[PDB]
């Protein structure tokens, strides 16, 4: 696999896997380091739709055996996997840091969503309940048990490379499912070496393939396109609200119920009573983790009159201290690059709609680059593409307040009162993250029951949804499924209801 | 007016609590005796369709803020009143679908029981306190409702089927636009009626009659596409199924779709026979063999397969057809529309074309073509003779889905072929074995695919509080009744509540 | 069964209920309208043991084909007995306030409570949910089902004669048991009827025996000590920590799991920042609602220092308004007797108690007399057993602080911050409700993670339970079982753990 | 010092984390060969036991509020600690209670189960979130730990048994006073030292040591009077749980109580008579019969009574016993203590005093009185041969406990007397049945009365993710394992939160 030395490490080449087997074939893409773009981390082939159709049919086969062993057996492989992500966490994250560019405390953590996602499913091996249930006759029994769907095709996005995946690998598998995966093309090594622990842990040939791929006329397309062959039984793909649309649709179709985690909008409301400087630490770091390229980042701060330029001021000078820079160099910045070029483009140009429909811009530069310098970047600014921490003032109703722009971006809205902020954080297409700053019960409680949102934070940021809580939005955000805990078992099975007779005669039911 | 066996009803829409005389007028003719006119009724354009669900958004404000247990209330309410009008509700029944009494009476039976299941549902919809990673923090569940439903539905189930998605959607907090089917709009009309007069607010519940394809059905599944349903809800064919989940798919709507099915019953060679029979014999032509589970498929093991066959055939010649409203002891009436009639008339030339063996029935029956137990007269309706073949699997009569009175015989040899035929049908709601060897009803019970198996049981008679669905082409994985429809009709909101007064970072 | 006429009703005489017949066998008691001691509600006997040990005897004959009975045609029987109920409320609501001398409303809402209780188990006889589990096997399945115990004893006190009653009777027939029930002999007629209607309902003859007599040296005790000849497989109490006691003891050493409902001293904190007139008005109506004879009555008002003598002065305003009488005549009194004898010596006692420890009586002259009148009272408070409103101050560690006196007493408490409030809650020997007002978020919660209660209110009273939550307390107040709901599905089943092979061979698990 | 297979540990109890070598001097020998010196520990008076549950109730105040996440992260370390000590842990068992390597590994593998299924347990233990009958009042259930928790422990399952107390009270926040079987006083230390490694906090575990009645485990249950425990678990005799209970029902403690058994295991004329025997054989002589498991009575039909017979004495003929740490092939070793061999050689004498008729066994073996199949010196320890009687129902053969190698026959005709015969005995923990006629199993299934039964498997073997208990003498409703152990060792705490701004009244 060690084609060349680069910079910060090797620069690996490596093909699909397919039944067990690694396949290179397809059109060399290549991920480089976004921090460093010298730094060449993989190259790796663009599989074909006739090679994503093999990786399903060698899931089908593989399923066969899987799905008749014991779900208890299943959960020692998630056991084994467990010790072997805890083994190999300082490896994952170094190697994080390098091939997406978040630091190395986030990368840590991202890696431990999936220990975290490991551990909750490999007893969930000695659970899975289904039901007994009494009959309305005597002599006879009723039965509820949770089977496999069958072939599972997973989508997903680079920004959380090892969370997000394992939120969708490990219950597909522990539930008896097996699987052809797409990782995102900005996290292919990351992706490889994720395949090859849960071989390592003892997981079957064939149950997990991976295809490696673009989106939009490549890979992601092709397998998508699939469904309509009849090759999966489910889909789940986290990802944007536009390619989401498309496959719901293609699911619908075809009967698939897929798992769609979308976008989000996220409101941050800090009200008058609010504790102001957890609220503006709240704030800042919901806008700023992960340079702003988190699903659930905050998209709107709407700030209760009474306080909002008390919390301007100090929320400009929190966002004045903001650490960037090329984290692999300078563990302890805040954040680092853009993880590709379409969201720094789609940034970029962010600046230019909110200009023309009157955004006020109270802070930020656009691009990072030695002719224009952020007074608080460390390290070479034109290695890769970095964005100056933004801070707009926005109307709602405009384009900047409703729609989703990945990077360092922020809005602040003025509102006045519990109703105009639940109002105004309802108004946007999107319901995955919300968040409000309050100590008066009964506003944490409005808020709670007025919004329109998958999951609310009270006195806590819109990031950082704990493991074993359900994952999920409404509106633009989802159409209804969840990940995480007991919440996904509906995603990757079925129930299937079974009655028993013994009274020797046909009985007829509510007659 | 007064009718033949009735009243005959006109009505309008139900919207916003106001009934709507607006649209072209349709006309539901008693599908036992064409010459008794059971309702007329307007056609609802696609504008109405759009200012019901407007209206069921406006009602659903002040619903949804209504205290579950309060909802609930409302529902037992409507557990008495359906009580109240069950003889009224099965004499409507018989009269409007053309089923017997004692089924219609069992129609009506479970939306009483789906009542009664969700009116104490009102003082549950658990979710879950959980415990946080972080000192002084707190982790919460709550189920909350979506919004506005659409539903449309079949008429072959007018009464309980749509209960199972018009009550437990109003008891999780949402409001409806409902399009009931045109082969039973008086019966839904009435359901409607008794949901006001249980307390169910105006505005809550919608009801827009109309047809399908072309008509109102179609213009409802449309305006998924204008953002006016946070749900939908459907019941009928696989071909209509797939489009609404196309619609719902593209509008980021999870869709309850309850599709069709060929429902296989294996019979063993250790079968108690005339159990199994009777059994096949009940799932064939209960409803004249027009339910969702009827059976498609009679999979008998090789060494009885010549015994079975014979008593199965003195069994169907024994089969009473008639108008039920005048021969209630029949099995059995007429076609519930002209659809299922002609697609039924189709079986029978494909069933020659493919090679299949016709064993038993002659087509529409007729004073020229007259059955021996028919009681009445056949040219008042549209009546079928029972049917029976002998088929290959792979054949078209095998593998799809045909409303009526027919069923095929297919020789298997052994538990492992039985299951392999049982599954070669693109199908997957029912399904049943009847054997005696707990090896063999293990094995049939875990490599079935289906949403329901029945153990020396019929392929049909659900109890109503287990989940009811089907895989493959019979549904997307949603499930109704019990407490498995409640992820149909609500969404998951996770709450952290901090109090440590400081940023604690997860993992 | 109607005997003689009386001064507000039939005086009604009636025997026990025995597989189906009445056995009017014993030495006679009577009960006598506590409002008005004139007033001849019922004559009834007074099972001895013997009849107690036949009624168990047709109890455990009659559960053999209860309990194959399938429990959704259980469930029917009960939902006819919501509408009986519901047709009966009227009736039974008039027949309370004369036997027990409750309001009219409170005893609307305690016949309610047996209604919400019919409607929930209603439904539960098509729930009942057991598992079906994964083996570690292939070829193999796991089971669990839920079995009815067989007969359950039941002895209940009279304060709440419909609901607290419901909460036992409904949930153990609905599970499959048979019953013998051992009603207060404070409410004969109400528990009489209440069986009469279950069986209008449709119950079985024998799956209900009821058994009137008394408590120590009287039926009560005895149908206790059966335990001891193995005629019950469950046995459920509500009343006095100190009887629960030995109930417990006799029913541990027979295996059995017993529900002991016992007393409470239930502490209800004021923190500076509550809204006061609220907290009055929850503090008030815990103290004097059923003339403070609720296991849930308020014991303690623990008022934060800095609000403590505005408290106080608005809360000795609130009691002095507190009407009081005969709930027949006059419907709209706060409360009216004692419900008996026992109560109201208690009572008289704890002045004398309170004076010897050197508590300040604020507020009240003890028995309300001609001689001694009470300036809100409304009709003749010689006819039966009255109680001044009562409050002291006390100190913790005092017997009028620690111990559970029934009647309409209450004490005020001086604490200083939440950590104090939450330490003197804790300071007594019981653990049922208990209740904070309280605007910062902060201090509920810490209210509720420290205390040590089965139930805990904010911003509420430590009275008013829901029905459909899980009721019991902790400490002296209970061992850990739940009435109600869900929850009580425990006390009335046992688990059957059934696992079934397939495979032909013999697995050996974990080896 | 040395031993003759492996080191003589000498050791104190654990309290507050320190060693506490106090009281006078017990020793645990090799039940295998009494030269073999395993262990010498103190035995704890009640005034150390005494200071073990305040040290627990100090320790509580800190772990209870440790987040459930994080005291899983502790059992998820024991988890991987367990796994590296695998080996140790099963030759030290195989030394110190005398069962076979296979036996042992098997009960530590159970401890490992628990370990994994409660590691993930910290980020689950759901309360409720309710809804209110009242607008703006939001209602929740939580799980609360009960306390300090005294755990008292038999020795036959010296890790498993223990894990399933141990594992789930401290996870659920609670702290332990342990007082284990002197049975097995070394693993018991280990395995405290083992939590410790994990980073179990000092203090939340404390282990006394010493004997039973007119001992540490008697003076422990009377502390129950004094207030210092929240909770007790209890596995042993049905006697001493009797009276345990008592104590513990005076005290408001809902105490778990796993008893005794007579086991029915039932075979049908249609069984696979091979199965049968093998499962019989095994339910009868796994650990030489001590498991609470054990079968007590082969039920076995009428028609097949002597083909049975011949076939399984043929079974038990081929037995081999021995010290299984010289001879790991063995199917069982010695009696565990001497209490053991002395209610076995009792019950020779009950038997013949009662007219039973004894198949197989001469009592203990001896040089003198040798059994064929021993392998090496059966006078090292207590050994017994194996032993079949037939018995006569109502008898104390059939209804009392008897722990060690013996098992009765007893004929049935049918299996409505198959059923009353196996519900004979004051006990109800496991049972089983061979069957293969469907009506057969299901009749058996839902007429025993019984925690536990299997069907067509062994009345030992339970799977450690099922509720495991029994009814009757068998236990008094508490199970443990799994999901179902947590009502054990937490409370209810409901909570309602007003946020109206007035008193609304319910009901």
Redesign the interface.
């Given at each position: 696999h060690r084609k060349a030395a680069g910079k910060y490490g090797n620069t690996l080449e490596f093909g699909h896997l397919v039944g067990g087997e690694e396949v290179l074939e397809g059109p060399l893409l290549e991920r480089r380091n976004p921090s460093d773009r010298e730094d060449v981390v993989a190259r790796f082939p663009e599989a074909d739709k006739d090679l994503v159709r093999k990786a399903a049919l060698k899931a089908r086969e593989a399923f066969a055996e899987w799905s008749?062993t014991?779900?208890?057996?299943r959960?020692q492989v998630l056991?084994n996997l467990?010790?072997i992500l805890e083994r190999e966490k300082p490896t994952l994250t170094r190697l994080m840091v390098r091939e997406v560019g978040k630091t190395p405390?986030e990368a840590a953590?991202?890696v431990?969503?999936a220990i975290?996602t490991a551990?909750?499913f490999?007893?969930?091996?000695?659970?899975?309940?289904?039901?007994?249930?009494?009959?309305?006759?005597?002599?006879?029994?009723?039965?509820?048990?949770r089977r496999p769907?069958g072939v599972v095709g997973i989508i997903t996005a680079g920004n959380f490379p090892i969370?997000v995946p394992s939120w969708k690998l490990i219950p597909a598998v522990l539930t008896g499912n097996t699987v052809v995966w797409k990782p995102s093309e900005d996290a292919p090594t990351l992706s490889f070496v994720f395949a090859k622990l849960f071989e390592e842990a003892g997981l079957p040939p064939g149950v997990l393939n991976v295809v490696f791929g673009g989106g939009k006329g490549s890979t992601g397309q092709w397998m998508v396109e699939l469904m309509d062959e009849g090759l999966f039984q489910k889909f789940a793909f986290t990802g944007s609200?536009q390619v989401?649309?498309?496959?719901?649709?293609?699911?619908?179709?075809?009967?698939?119920?897929?798992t769609?985690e979308?976008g989000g909008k996220n409101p941050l409301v800090v009200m008058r009573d609010a504790?102001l400087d957890?609220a503006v630490?709240?704030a800042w770091?919901s806008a700023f983790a992960t340079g702003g390229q988190r699903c659930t980042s905050a998209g709107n701060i709407l700030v209760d009159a009474p306080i909002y330029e008390e919390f301007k001021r100090r929320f400009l000078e929190r966002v004045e201290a903001t650490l960037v820079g090329n984290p692999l160099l300078h563990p302890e910045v805040t954040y680092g690059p853009f993880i590709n070029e379409r969201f720094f483009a789609r940034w970029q140009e962010h600046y230019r709609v909110g200009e023309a429909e009157g955004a006020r811009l109270l802070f930020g530069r656009g691009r990072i680059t030695r002719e224009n310098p952020y007074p608080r970047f460390l390290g070479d600014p034109e290695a890769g593409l970095y964005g100056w921490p933004t801070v707009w003032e926005v109307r709602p109703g405009t384009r900047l307040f409703t729609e989703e722009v990945f990077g360092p971006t922020i809005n602040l809205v003025k509102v006045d009162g519990i109703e105009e902020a639940i109002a105004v954080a309802n108004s946007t297409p999107y319901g995955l993250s919300s968040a409000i700053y309050t100590?008066?019960?009964?506003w944490?409680?409005?808020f709670?029951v007025g919004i329109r949102?998958?999951?609310?934070?009270?006195?806590?940021?819109t990031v950082?949804?704990?493991?074993?809580?359900?994952?999920?939005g409404?509106?633009?955000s989802?159409?209804?499924?969840?990940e995480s805990?007991?919440?996904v078992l509906?995603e990757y099975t079925?129930?299937?209801?079974?009655?028993?007779?013994?009274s020797?005669?046909?009985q007829?039911?509510?007659?």
């Open positions: 008749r014991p779900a208890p057996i959960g056991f467990v010790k405390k953590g991202d431990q969503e975290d551990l909750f490999a007893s969930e091996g000695r659970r899975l309940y289904g039901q007994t249930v009494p009959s309305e006759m005597r002599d006879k029994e009723l039965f509820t048990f769907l969370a609200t989401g649309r498309w496959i719901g649709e293609v699911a619908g179709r075809n009967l698939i119920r897929p769609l979308l504790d957890l630490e709240g770091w100590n008066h019960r009964h944490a409680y409005l709670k949102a998958g999951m609310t934070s009270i006195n806590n940021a950082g949804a704990e493991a074993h809580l359900p994952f999920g409404v509106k633009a989802g159409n209804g499924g969840r805990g007991i919440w509906e079925y129930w299937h209801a079974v009655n028993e007779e013994y020797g005669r046909l007829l039911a509510q007659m």
